[PDB]
Design a protein around this ligand. Structure first.
Ligand SMILES: [Zn+2]
Ligand SMILES: [Zn+2]
Ligand SMILES: [Zn+2]
Lengths: 89, 196, 55, 129, 223
RNA sequence: CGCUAUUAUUGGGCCUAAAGCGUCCGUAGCCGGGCCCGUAAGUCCCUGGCGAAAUCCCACGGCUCAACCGUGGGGCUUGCUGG
RNA sequence: UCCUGGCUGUAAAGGAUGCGGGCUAGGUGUCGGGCGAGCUUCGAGCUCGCCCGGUGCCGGAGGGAAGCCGUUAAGCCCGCCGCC
């Protein structure tokens, strides 16, 4: 067997030289005063993780499913990205 | 009962078909002679003629086309136009009368009449492209493709074409109420025919 | 709005289709729709009011 | 030779619908075919099917109304549990509730919605949409 | 604004153009599901004034073709262009010319004449909302050697497809989709026509009156 | 590894581009018409005993947050077995 | 090259198209069998129509990169074997 190795927490784009992505990331970098693209990319990865969790949980039947739903909603409310009376959509 | 005494139909030759046939015409077909010739029923002809009369009377007169590439159908069509105020194109139907607005005589009608869907395959196609209903006289060898009303009739006889368009004009005028009753229509059947 | 339905089959009429519509040549209260498929395949239609059963 | 009459029936239906027919005759009849037709009637894809009796077997006479896009038999008849339906949904249907998987259970032939409500699985035999 | 600017210097040649200019046809949806022929781009310029904005006029492909003669080679330009209201109406056109401007203009005119409307919805297993941000069910399209299959996706999944499909679906008003393809997708004309036909085939799927509220189906413009 | 539906169960192709045996009869094997009764081996449901920990997902808490560690809840363990 | 009795086992051995089964418009020829009408020089004869099976030419939807195929599929389904 092979043991564990720690893995990155950010993703890179599939193509490095697309004009639209370049322009958008340029604007964001400038208007939020970032140093690199790693920061932008890892915030985007946070978002994508939230979005995948929602897509998975949606229409899943059981008990752990609803537990995880409420966990997600409470975590978002605590972070400050959603109000209290919110839903999975 | 009938629009015309049956023997007149018979002497004109409305019940005379080809030596061919088609599954789509088994309804209108009635018999097969010992010669190979097929015979059409005249009741259905009468009924479809009445129905076509009502249908065309429900239309604006001057938006109606009558087309006959055949030679024995150019004069009947011309007099149908004269009697009903409808347009008639005897000869050729220059391709583009309906699809090309840059020709001399460009028109867009509401309904089309056809003497043979096999010879008049150009007008039929343009009419299909512009999306209008079609009334066609059909014989035993004809199909019913892209045809919304069919009149079973011998298409090649001059007497038959003359009698058919005569009846049609009479019925259209009646249902339009330009006349009170039949026999108020004093045009003779010997005018619609092609001269020699 | 509302999408018309063919009288022979029960399918909706598509936008750029070569379909047609007219008034029943027998009675005159219903409207007959015909899609390109029934027109090219000679599929028979029938009036909903009186059942004229045209071509 | 003749292996499966259900597939023949369903394909005959698809072709006749695609070409614009009113009635459909199914010569080798069975009881699965009747049950499948019953489900399809309850869900609203056909009308007025009846059984005719000749000395060989039955014949089925069906009326179509224009509410079918596709229909077919699932081979091989896969076993399925009450926990793995979305897979075969995504595989045989175009949207999340669009059409019917037809399942054969120890309580009879049914749709997968009913089977899931009851909490059971079975074997897959057909799909319609 | 420029309604009296586009409607005053136009004389109709056909009967649909006259119907539109007089004022008896007033909405874009009244010209489609009849057997009407469209032989004037001013009809669409009147009923959809948004297709005239330059930001709704993607030019897709420009090619240079050669015909041999004993003198030399005769050159022609072919331009494939796309037009569309961003709320359910799209058009695709091809134009030929002895130079590039003539070809572009003819392509945009033929794109205006080839206008279709589409249906939108959600239809995804992972979103299940009722908002017309995608197509409501998977559809198929074919052209030449190219086969395309479109599937609905969840919100925020933006247009997983090649760039020609990206631009056509963006002009259609669609925002989320998954795709599969087969064939010579490097030929832009066939890929574009296959995606156009896929978008057209949303009108070919039969539905029941209970599906319109499950998927939030919208025909043409929304709201 | 993916790109590659260029190894294709999902999911490819064999007139002309690679590709139907020269044609037939048949062994194993795979596929097999309609109704009725039985059994319950496959299949389905409920439950008992097992599939070490670390690793994987989620929430909370402790090192400035994190990476890391801890408490708990789930999966993984391609499954075996008693009713 | 022909006859008798044996070996070899190959070809553009080509419909360059593996075999079985159900379905998706038809038209017109020809071959065999059967049925029904009319002619007859009374012929196992002539003509017309229908059902079944073989073999050809056209052709609409439909299919295909196209040429073209198109109920004798190169179309949609249920199967097995050979090959790339
Ligand atoms: Zn129809
Ligand atoms: Zn009526
Ligand atoms: Zn959605």
């Amino acid at each position: 067997g092979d043991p564990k190795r720690q893995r990155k927490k950010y993703e890179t784009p599939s193509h490095p030289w697309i004009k639209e992505r370049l322009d958008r990331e340029r604007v964001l970098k400038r208007n939020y005063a970032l140093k690199n693209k790693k920061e932008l990319w890892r915030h985007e990865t946070q978002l994508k993780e939230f979005r995948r969790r929602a897509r998975r949980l949606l229409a899943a039947r059981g008990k752990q499913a609803e537990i995880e739903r409420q966990q997600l909603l409470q975590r978002l409310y605590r972070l400050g990205l959603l109000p209290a009376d919110a839903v999975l959509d | 009962e009938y629009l015309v005494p049956l023997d007149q139909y018979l002497a004109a030759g409305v019940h005379i078909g080809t030596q061919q046939k088609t599954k789509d015409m088994k309804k209108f077909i009635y018999r097969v002679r010992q010669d190979g010739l097929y015979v059409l029923d005249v009741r259905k002809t009468d009924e479809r003629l009445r129905v076509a009369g009502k249908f065309l009377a429900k239309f604006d007169p001057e938006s109606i086309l009558a087309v006959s590439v055949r030679l024995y159908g150019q004069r009947p069509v011309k007099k149908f136009g004269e009697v009903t105020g409808a347009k008639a194109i005897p000869g050729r139907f220059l391709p583009g009368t309906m699809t090309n607005p840059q020709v001399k005589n460009f028109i867009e009608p509401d309904v089309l009449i056809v003497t043979d869907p096999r010879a008049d395959h150009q007008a039929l196609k343009e009419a299909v492209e512009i999306g209008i209903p079609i009334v066609a006289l059909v014989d035993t060898e004809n199909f019913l493709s892209y045809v919304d009303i069919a009149i079973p009739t011998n298409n090649k006889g001059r007497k038959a074409l003359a009698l058919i368009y005569w009846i049609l004009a009479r019925e259209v005028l009646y249902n339009r109420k330009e006349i009170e009753s039949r026999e108020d229509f004093k045009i003779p059947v010997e005018d619609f025919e092609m001269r020699i | 709005f509302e999408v018309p339905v063919c009288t022979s089959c029960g399918k909706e009429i598509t936008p750029r289709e070569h379909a047609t519509h007219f008034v029943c040549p027998n009675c005159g209260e219903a409207i007959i729709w015909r899609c390109e498929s029934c027109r090219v395949l000679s599929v028979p239609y029938k009036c909903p009011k009186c059942g004229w059963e045209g071509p | 030779t003749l292996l499966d009459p259900l597939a023949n029936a369903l394909s005959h239906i698809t072709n006749s619908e695609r070409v614009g027919k009113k009635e459909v005759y199914i010569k080798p009849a069975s009881k699965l075919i009747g049950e499948v037709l019953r489900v399809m009637l309850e869900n609203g894809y056909i009308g007025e099917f009846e059984l005719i009796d000749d000395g060989r077997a039955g014949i089925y006479r069906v009326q179509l109304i224009g509410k079918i896009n596709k229909a077919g038999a699932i081979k091989p008849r896969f076993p399925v549990k009450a926990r793995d339906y979305e897979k075969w949904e995504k595989r045989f249907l175009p949207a999340f509730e669009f059409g019917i998987l037809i399942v054969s259970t120890s309580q009879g032939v049914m749709t997968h919605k009913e089977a899931l409500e009851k909490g059971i699985g079975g074997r897959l035999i057909a799909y319609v949409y | 604004e420029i309604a009296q600017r586009v409607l005053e210097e136009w004389e109709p040649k056909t009967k649909l153009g006259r119907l539109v200019k007089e004022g008896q046809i007033t909405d874009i949806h009244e010209i489609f599901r009849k057997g009407y022929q469209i032989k004037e781009p001013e009809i669409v310029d009147v009923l959809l004034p948004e297709v005239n904005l330059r930001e709704n006029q993607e030019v897709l492909d420009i090619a240079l073709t050669v015909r041999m003669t004993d003198s030399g080679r005769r050159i022609r330009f072919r331009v494939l262009a796309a037009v569309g209201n961003r709320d359910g109406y799209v058009g695709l056109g091809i134009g030929h010319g002895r130079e590039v401007g003539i070809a572009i203009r003819k392509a945009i005119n033929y794109a205006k004449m080839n206008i279709i409307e589409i249906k939108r919805g959600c239809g995804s297993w992972e979103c299940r909302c009722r908002r017309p941000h995608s197509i409501p069910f998977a559809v198929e399209g074919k052209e030449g050697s190219v086969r395309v299959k479109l599937m609905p996706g969840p919100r925020g999944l933006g247009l997983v497809i090649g760039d020609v499909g990206k631009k056509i679906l963006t002009l259609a008003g669609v925002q989320d989709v998954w795709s599969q393809t087969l064939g010579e997708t490097r030929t832009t004309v066939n890929f574009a026509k296959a995606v156009f036909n896929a978008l057209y085939n949303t009108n070919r799927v039969a539905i029941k009156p209970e599906d319109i509220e499950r998927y939030g189906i919208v025909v043409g413009r929304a709201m």
